[PDB]
A paper describes a structure:
Rhodopsin (Rho), composed of seven transmembrane domains, a characteristic of all G protein-coupled receptors (GPCRs), and its covalently bound chromophore 11-cis-retinylidene, is a major component of the intracellular disk membranes of rod photoreceptor cells. Upon photoisomerization of its chromophore from 11- cis- to all-trans-retinylidene, the photoactivated rhodopsin (Rho*) undergoes a complex sequence of structural changes, leading to the signaling state of the receptor, metarhodopsin II (Meta II). Crystal structures of Nb2 in complex with native rhodopsin reveal a mechanism of allosteric modulation involving extracellular loop 2 and native glycans. Nb2 binding suppresses Schiff base deprotonation and hydrolysis and prevents intracellular outward movement of helices five and six – a universal activation event for GPCRs.
Accordingly, we hypothesized that Nb2 binding to EL2 stabilized Lumi- or Meta I-like intermediates upon photoactivation by locking the EL2 plug of the chromophore binding pocket, preventing large structural changes on the cytoplasmic side. We tested this hypothesis by comparing crystal structures of ground-state bRho, bRho*, and opsin in complex with Nb2 to a published structure of bovine opsin. First, crystals of ground-state bRho in a complex with Nb2 were photoactivated by green light, resulting in a change in their color from red to orange, mimicking the experimental conditions where pre-formed bRho/Nb2 complexes were trapped as Meta I-like photoproducts after illumination. a–c Superposition of the crystal structures of bRho/Nb2 (red), bRho*/Nb2 (orange), and apo-opsin/Nb2 (sky blue) complexes at 3.7-Å, 4.25-Å, and 3.7-Å resolution, respectively. Superposition of bRho/Nb2 (red), bRho*/Nb2 (orange), and opsin/Nb2 (cyan) revealed overall similar arrangements. We did not detect any major movements of the binding interface between Nb2 and the extracellular loops of bRho* or opsin compared to that of bRho/Nb2, as the retinal plug formed by EL2 remained in place over the orthosteric binding pocket. The E(D)RY ionic lock appears to remain intact in the bRho/Nb2, bRho*/Nb2, and opsin/Nb2 structures, as no rotation of Glu134 on TM3 or Glu247 on TM6 was observed. We show that Nb2 exerts its allosteric antagonist activity on Rho* by binding to its extracellular domain and preventing the otherwise small conformational changes associated with full activation despite the cognate agonist (all-trans-retinal) being present in the binding pocket.
Residue numbers in the entry:
A (entry chain C), B (entry chain D): 1 to 114
C (entry chain B): 1 to 144, 149 to 228, 241 to 323
D (entry chain A): 1 to 64, 70 to 147, 151 to 230, 241 to 323
The structure:
Amino acid sequence: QVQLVESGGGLVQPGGSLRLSCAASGFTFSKYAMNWVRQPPGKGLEWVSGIRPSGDNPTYADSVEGRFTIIRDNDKKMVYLQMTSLKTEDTAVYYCTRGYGTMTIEGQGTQVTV
Amino acid sequence: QVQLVESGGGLVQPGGSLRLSCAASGFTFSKYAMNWVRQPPGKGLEWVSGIRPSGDNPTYADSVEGRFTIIRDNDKKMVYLQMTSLKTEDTAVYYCTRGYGTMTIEGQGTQVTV
Amino acid sequence: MNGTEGPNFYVPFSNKTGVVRSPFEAPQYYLAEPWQFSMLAAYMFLLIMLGFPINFLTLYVTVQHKKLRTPLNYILLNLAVADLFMVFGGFTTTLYTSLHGYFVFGPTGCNLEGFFATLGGEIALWSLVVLAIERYVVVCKPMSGENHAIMGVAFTWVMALACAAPPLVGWSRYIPEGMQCSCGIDYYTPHEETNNESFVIYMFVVHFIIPLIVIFFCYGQLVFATTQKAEKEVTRMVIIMVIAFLICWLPYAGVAFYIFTHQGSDFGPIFMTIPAFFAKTSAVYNPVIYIMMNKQFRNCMVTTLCC
Amino acid sequence: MNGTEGPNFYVPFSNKTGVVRSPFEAPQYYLAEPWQFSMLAAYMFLLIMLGFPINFLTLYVTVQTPLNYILLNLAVADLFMVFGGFTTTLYTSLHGYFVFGPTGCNLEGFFATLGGEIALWSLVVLAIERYVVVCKPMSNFRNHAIMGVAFTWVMALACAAPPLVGWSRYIPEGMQCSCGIDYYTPHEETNNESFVIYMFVVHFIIPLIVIFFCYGQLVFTVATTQKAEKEVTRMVIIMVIAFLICWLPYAGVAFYIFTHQGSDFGPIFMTIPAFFAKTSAVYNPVIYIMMNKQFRNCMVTTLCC
Ligand SMILES: *[C@@H]1O[C@H](CO)[C@@H](O[C@@H]2O[C@H](CO)[C@@H](O[C@@H]3O[C@H](CO[C@H]4O[C@H](CO)[C@@H](O)[C@H](O)[C@@H]4O)[C@@H](O)[C@H](O[C@H]4O[C@H](CO)[C@@H](O)[C@H](O)[C@@H]4O[C@@H]4O[C@H](CO)[C@@H](O)[C@H](O)[C@H]4NC(C)=O)[C@@H]3O)[C@H](O)[C@H]2NC(C)=O)[C@H](O)[C@H]1NC(C)=O
Ligand SMILES: *[C@@H]1O[C@H](CO)[C@@H](O[C@@H]2O[C@H](CO)[C@@H](O[C@@H]3O[C@H](CO[C@H]4O[C@H](CO)[C@@H](O)[C@H](O)[C@@H]4O)[C@@H](O)[C@H](O[C@H]4O[C@H](CO)[C@@H](O)[C@H](O)[C@@H]4O)[C@@H]3O)[C@H](O)[C@H]2NC(C)=O)[C@H](O)[C@H]1NC(C)=O
Ligand SMILES: *[C@@H]1O[C@H](CO)[C@@H](O[C@@H]2O[C@H](CO)[C@@H](O[C@@H]3O[C@H](CO)[C@@H](O)[C@H](O)[C@@H]3O)[C@H](O)[C@H]2NC(C)=O)[C@H](O)[C@H]1NC(C)=O
Ligand SMILES: *[C@@H]1O[C@H](CO)[C@@H](O[C@@H]2O[C@H](CO)[C@@H](O)[C@H](O)[C@H]2NC(C)=O)[C@H](O)[C@H]1NC(C)=O
């Protein structure tokens, strides 16, 4: 029975920083992949970042290309998103999805208001 | 080149009366049937009345069943709608269509405001 | 308000109820039961199913053999051609439209169905005008082969297109018939803009009456060993080919006229659609005769099959 | 990402562009050229076109030997393919996506699965049957046939049903026109990882064992009884030859994706061998006419009344 925690995030300074978390529960974690996806206040979900099951190859959108950075802990069942040099449009509710999809399991996410 | 005049009609008594007209031009008139159709200010077109090409059998909606009455002049190329004992919801723009359709061919119509 | 006339279409059902909608927009399940539309697709499937194989083998076998160059074979290949134009041009559209329950393809989608239904009947008709002329010239022997036949099979396409093209010209038009699954000439509306009143005359005159004249004109000439066995079976098949054509096309032709006469009258959707779909067997029955009756073909067909 | 995973589906194309949409919602014309979807319908039409007549004549003529029971059983399942599967995929090829819906996909995949498995387990029966006649291990031993043709359906449904159970699933493959077992996503919720093993084990390896187990008996092996034997035991060979030609490519790519899950591969990679393997409906009876002379005679009897 699947359960993704959505820890890390809050109100942050324009041009600040913040580290996100995502504790996975109830599945073979290392056996598949995990993504980060955010909900901008107004427009549809943006696929932020993603990473392979082994964790070898991360991928980012142009929007947060190199500012954000993604990495996962297979042992602990966790996914992180170190967001740096933030902006006002990075203000959104961040969800961590499984597989390769923008389809969000869990929810509430993390309201990272910049 | 088809040309349907939409004469008769205007501002009328609650429980008044009014006779409408429809001078047909640019087709074999008696070869065709003719209808009356109105545009309520708010809701979609109502098929008011209709009559066969020979003029034999006139047909009415239950809305204006027996209050309104339809008759046509093949000689003069004209269609009439004697409206009697009117109501506020009879307020509409009346068009005379050909054939059997609520498909409205071009006319002024006639804003019969009750 | 018996039927409901629109720009493109005419629905044989009163829009007193308010239910009536265009068959170029929504499915017409208020007309008949939704399973009957499935029954049409079922019927119409099997026309395409036994349409292609019977016609394609008959097309292939005739051309493959450098034999089989008799006037009969030219016509019955010409039919195998037009029958495949029916199957792929017409039947496909109507089988798909039967599913959705309306001409989902659009106004031009209707033109397809009606066009190759019109070619199929006319190329079948004018071919029986040729078969009528040809069996009179050999049997009664009034004027004492290959070139003759090819000229007279080109005639059938010339005349069929005199019939089928003008709807697409804009004189007359193809319009959904009955259940709004088949299409055909506008017998329903006067549509003087289209002038389709005049076309129906032209069609029943030039493309029905004139043919049936020349058919029975030639048939009336023949009221008063092995060459004549070949003659007999093939001149008998000309008869059976017309017998079938009359079986097929009469019903629809009758109803088509009945509506033309009684325009604006009270008639159901199934009235027209039944004889219309029945007359779409013209694609399949023609070659079935050519195998059944013509023995010389049947031999050579098995040659091609059983290599 | 390389591919785009969704609840129902997996599109072998990056949504980096933003273009990717579900094949249970919108047409997938960003995957391949729109005319290639028409080419699928063109190809897929002709499978249904020469599917029904060849199978229906073969079904009719047979009912109007163990071999004939199986090659009627195939004519049955081939018509289940044509009307059950091919219809859906020919219609889906038009629209360019499973317009029918998630259950619309299950149809396509189910009878594609039956068709292959009933074709496979029938060749397991044909393998067993000549071994018992040619090598002659049990003396006077050939209603046997009807029991062993019921076997093929028993085992094919062991393979085709469980996706519909919810162990594994049918999922749009390649151009999102065919459907098949989920080789792509781990989908541990569905547990489809385990099924792929089960299928390549129980419904591929075990059959091909028993086939070549019986075929290997006639390595030391290879008047008119044996002419009838020879041509019909030769047809068993040609029937498998065709089956291997047909099913290998798709089976290979299916495993290749199972191995390299999440890797970079295009939509056409899988769809080509998948649609190729849908000739299983048509080729089987064509052999049964072409090779089996006893049938061919009596087919023409039914035809030429
Ligand atoms: C491939 O990549 C594409 C990239 O776009 C991706 O498309 C996006 O898919 C996501 C779904 O996974 C879409 O998200 C939804 O968008 C809804 C609105 O979308 C329309 O409107 C916006 C503008 O408002 C347009 O930009 C857009 O073009 C659309 O026309 C949005 O309403 C959804 O969010 C609401 O619903 C979720 C789910 O229930 C909820 O959790 C959210 O909170 C949200 O509700 C909000 O509530 C507030 C407060 O009450 C309310 O005021 C507000 O209206 C709601 N929020 C919004 C934004 O309206 C959801 O985010 C996204 O739009 C798609 N983008 C586009 C441009 O299409 C594909 O999915 C990918 N394909 C595959 C197969 O992977
Ligand atoms: C069989 O009979 C039915 C009887 O309903 C016909 O259905 C009606 O067809 C008329 C055709 O014009 C439609 O009229 C149009 O309605 C528009 C609004 O309708 C929608 O929104 C209102 C609410 O605002 C709802 O009540 C309604 O249900 C609809 O959802 C009008 O805005 C249109 O006006 C515009 O075009 C006309 C052109 O005549 C102009 O005069 C106007 O100024 C304006 O620009 C228009 O009046 C009507 O809505 C239909 N009703 C239904 C079912 O919704 C069928 O058409 C008829 N079938 C056939 C085949 O003939
Ligand atoms: C999309 O699929 C491609 C394969 O088609 C994936 O590329 C693979 O990426 C991994 C990790 O970066 C590569 O592993 C490394 O490759 C080097 C060089 O070949 C090797 O020496 C190292 O030991 C290491 O294993 C892998 O080889 C590579 N595959 C190829 C052949 O390109 C990629 O992960 C996918 N893209 C994403 C991010 O989804
Ligand atoms: C619908 O068609 C019917 C015929 O099917 C028409 O019925 C005729 O009605 C007129 C009276 O209006 C009579 O003079 C005729 O004798 C009727 N025919 C018969 C024998 O049924 C009817 O007019 C049409 N409906 C409308 C109103 O157009």
